[PDB]
Design an enzyme around this catalytic site. Sequence first.
Site, PDB file in Angstrom:
ATOM      1  N   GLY F 146       0.827  -1.182   0.000  1.00 56.04           N
ATOM      2  CA  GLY F 146       0.000   0.000   0.000  1.00 56.04           C
ATOM      3  C   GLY F 146       0.858   1.226   0.000  1.00 56.04           C
ATOM      4  N   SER F 170      -3.789   0.055  -2.217  1.00 57.63           N
ATOM      5  CA  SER F 170      -3.674  -0.582  -0.934  1.00 57.63           C
ATOM      6  C   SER F 170      -3.892  -2.013  -1.250  1.00 57.63           C
ATOM      7  N   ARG F 171      -2.822  -2.826  -1.117  1.00 59.47           N
ATOM      8  CA  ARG F 171      -2.855  -4.210  -1.499  1.00 59.47           C
ATOM      9  C   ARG F 171      -3.808  -4.978  -0.634  1.00 59.47           C
ATOM     10  N   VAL F 172      -3.715  -4.796   0.703  1.00 59.40           N
ATOM     11  CA  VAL F 172      -4.616  -5.416   1.640  1.00 59.40           C
ATOM     12  C   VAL F 172      -5.976  -4.810   1.534  1.00 59.40           C
ATOM     13  N   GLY F 173      -6.030  -3.460   1.483  1.00 57.04           N
ATOM     14  CA  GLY F 173      -7.176  -2.673   1.101  1.00 57.04           C
ATOM     15  C   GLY F 173      -8.469  -3.097   1.733  1.00 57.04           C
TER      16      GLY F 173
END
Lengths: 120, 236, 48, 265, 303, 303
Positions: F146, F170-173
């Site tokens: 992110g 945001s990868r986890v987002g």
Amino acid sequence: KLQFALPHETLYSEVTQVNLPAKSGRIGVLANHVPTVEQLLPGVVEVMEGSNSKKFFISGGFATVQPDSQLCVTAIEAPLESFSENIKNLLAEAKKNVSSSREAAEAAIQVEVLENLQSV
Amino acid sequence: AEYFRDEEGQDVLLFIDNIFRFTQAGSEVSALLGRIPSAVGYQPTLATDMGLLQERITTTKKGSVTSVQAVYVPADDLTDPAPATTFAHLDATTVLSRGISELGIYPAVDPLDSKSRLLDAAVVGQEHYDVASKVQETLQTYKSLQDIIAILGMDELSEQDKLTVERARKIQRFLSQPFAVAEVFTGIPGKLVRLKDTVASFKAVLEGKYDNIPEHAFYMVGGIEDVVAKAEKLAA
Amino acid sequence: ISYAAYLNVAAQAIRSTELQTASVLNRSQTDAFYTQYKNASEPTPITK
Amino acid sequence: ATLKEVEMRLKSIKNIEKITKTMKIVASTRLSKAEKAKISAKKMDEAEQLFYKNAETKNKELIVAITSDKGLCGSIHSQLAKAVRRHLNDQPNADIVTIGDKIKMQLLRTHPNNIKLSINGIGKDAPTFQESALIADKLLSVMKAGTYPKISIFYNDPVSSLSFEPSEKPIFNAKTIEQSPSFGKFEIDTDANVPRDLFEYTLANQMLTAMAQGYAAEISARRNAMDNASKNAGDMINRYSILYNRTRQAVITNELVDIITGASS
Amino acid sequence: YVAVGQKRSTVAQLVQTLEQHDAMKYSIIVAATASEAAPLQYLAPFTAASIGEWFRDNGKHALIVYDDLSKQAVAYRQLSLLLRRPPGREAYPGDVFYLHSRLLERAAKLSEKEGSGSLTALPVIETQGGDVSAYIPTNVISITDGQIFLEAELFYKGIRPAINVGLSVSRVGSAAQVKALKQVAGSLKLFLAQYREVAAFAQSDLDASTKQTLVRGERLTQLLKQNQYSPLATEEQVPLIYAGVNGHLDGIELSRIGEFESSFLSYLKSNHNELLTEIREKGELSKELLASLKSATESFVAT
Amino acid sequence: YVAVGQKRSTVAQLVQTLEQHDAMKYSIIVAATASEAAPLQYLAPFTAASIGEWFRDNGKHALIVYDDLSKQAVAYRQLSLLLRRPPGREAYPGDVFYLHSRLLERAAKLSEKEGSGSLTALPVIETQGGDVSAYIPTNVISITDGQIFLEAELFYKGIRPAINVGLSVSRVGSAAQVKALKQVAGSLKLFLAQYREVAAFAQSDLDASTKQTLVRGERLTQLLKQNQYSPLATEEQVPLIYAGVNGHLDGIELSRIGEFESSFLSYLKSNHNELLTEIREKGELSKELLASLKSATESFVAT
């Protein structure tokens, strides 16, 4: 065959009887009519194709029956909606204007248009 | 891996993650060792060290270690030395694009940017080569055709051109294959299609034998035989 | 006053009827400058 | 530097690409309205021509030409200008009426003698009867159109939707109407001054059609040209990108070397 | 064939390829693969050239391909840095010019006293992103006489071999040609250096003259390409060049160019291979041979 | 809050601001100011991380904001160079990657064995002219998952916060996004995506579709403005975004968006605080609530 065409629209460009207000008074064209050139005056125009009739309010133009039975009508603005009070207001203003000023010719055209509109 | 290959005979496939991080790690070790860092801040021993890693990966008479590496090129500059050293080792490239995933195609592999160096005619078989070349040409032409075909209008297509569009959009959908692992993930039971049957499938689609069947009846299908079934169910 | 100038004025008047559209209004409103030129010099731009 | 001058220049090229892209799209939108107009106009024209043809249309002169105020419509402006120059060799000293600036300038270079009337303030709008009518009215009064035994109008005929061929046509004088055997194919009395009326009416109607054909050719050309611009700009993006990448690497190397030299000591 | 800095696997395939074409028996391969230690790699071209010189100094003609000298450069860079000799220009060691130059000038065409030995050097330089203004390539270009730059764009656009003709020169090459291939050679390099110009400005007024050149140029370009790993006889090259130069082939639509070459060659062999055998041995096209070829080519052109 | 290299005067303002919002009652401010010595500056995030660990270890949650690691880098640089430890790229230590990675890996969300606790972290990196290519940015970008990238143009254009949404990922987002807000904000992402593409069309004759997008985009941009130092409640985030998504706000004049927003919030607070409390407490948007929510928005749009 009727060719009725405007710059921004094209109408009848078959038609049975067409009633036109022309330099030569009023002209009606039905089937074969000798090939003519007529200046269309500011007008109330009726076009009938069969019994159906459509009524146009027309800014004048030219009419030319072609010898091949193509009634070329060219006009700037021609329908029923075009006639469809404000013009009377405008004519009063335009009449006042005639006193000082080409505008006189304009107002004269306006009297014609108001009368022509009133005719409807 | 070498224990598997050499000492259990098995053909194996060893994934490596970022080889950018292989380079980065090596670069640090050089600096720590105090060696003069070479061009664009990369260890002087960069080539040789990677060489050891990527020559231990080889096909022996006992086995083969196939290696899938992940290349996270820095700055997107392919001209950078670390990518270059990587590219020297690489034999094939699979270029998974997100645009492709955005076209709803899982696999995400961009077919026009996926290229292999053992795509050679002799190597892959002449028949396979000819079929492949046709699919590449079809897709290549399709992409270019879609550029102005979309803008100008689809009616502008010639009979030949829309034939290509028809085949291509069907191939594009036919590419879509759900994966066994992702049976859960997509929710759709996966499909694994063997190599021989892959050649067969594309040969038929090129000849448009089954092209007369909806494109979404070719969407997410398995092999050629399978999409005969899907066509029937889609229609039903 | 040219015949078609006469017709033009009539056309403009005719949209004054109650029912109106932008294209009509544009057809009834435009500006320009006609500029004379000599055998050289340009007599001053006069609005059309 | 190298690095920054590359980057700013590349940014310029990028912005240029964006602008040429934007124009090309907007041009397509604008073009649609233009084409619609051109059809309607051409149909109207055909009715006037119906008279002239059937009549037998047999004919210092006038030359009228049209090219907008604005440029960057490709070579619309200059292909028509060139085609004026050839037929202005042909004419002895004909008076050129230039409707819009771009052709006006080019012709002014070729002769300043012949330029007598010119317009300006036309091009930005799509042609309308109002414009044509006024231009015609001023043409009659100012240039005394009848003096010219032949009139000719120049415009750009939009030959194909990716081409434009500059084209001209002859406007038929009142004399033409007089001496054509149009009495043998039509009927008027004599009370009407059908030559003096029809001449005036078709002076404008023919000009309006020409303007419509031209306007469409201009916008069409602008679309074609700006599209080709986008392609040329893209190539330049790639060329400067390679320069950028090389330059970036070089900066790293050159800086690094300085650090090494210091460390070595 | 000196293979320096090449994958040991790939080289093993190359060896097998060469033995498949049963060519190994006339060739030596020296190998200094990627695995092999950097000092060995550094010394790898020099040692190979010693082997080559023994042939040269038999007076016998030989050839040596040093693939890639760029991989020698990386090796010498590594070595220099590991000797902690101060970094050179572009981080390539400062004695890199000496390294290549000492290597390169050991390949030669000797004088009659020395029995006119040959050892033809063709060294293979790997331009990073086709950067032809980069320190290692430019130094090499300056050492060598003539270069054969190859272009990625053409390669991608299916011209294999992708011989860029903007950047291929030969600075001593025209002496090399056999008289037949000088006669048939008609400065096509100039002609297609008009084709490059023609297509430069194809992208203004395209005059019929330019179009004629473009039509010829395009047709010639199609003719040049040849499928990899299928080399053609010198004799066979003589008519092909004749055709294009004398514009006999110019007139054949682009689609049938591929057909034309194979068919033309087959036609000539069937029609009378006697002409080609004569030009093969004579090594010259007499006025009669030139006419005979004109006639034979005209014969094929018709069919 | 980990104040790294920040003037004591600036941190005094920070402390004062925290006191104004009476937030000291859950804050800890680890301060290594500019004046503080380069070892202290070096150890300042490391020291801070340890403080976080007690909370995390206790299974609680906490947020450590390292601001700015860009200045941490400089201090490590200062130490390494002064200790004459081998210099490296951009005169930054060779193990700077290692330094940053060590800090950034000591934050996590723990297993249920470890009491599910966590240490949320939000590192701040100062970009020198937005050069993400720069060595310290590139390294950090890799380590982190992110990014939020504020952009100067947006700031100038009065979009505060100035987050460039193109350059934010945001990868986890959405894994941790609240369900209610997730439901009503897929659309928002897509709309904004279109707005970016349709941006350049801002300069005449434009398709109606393009214009609709343009209207949505401009109104949305106004909606995403926020008054600095006045955070908003999630229960008030959700209604506002729903309206924009339903295009209710599209009709509202651009200038009146700001007033509309606050008014809408007050309107919801008076009229529909049943809805607000439901949204908050359920933490989910039932179809029945969304029905009511549309109604409320319609009523507010009317007046």
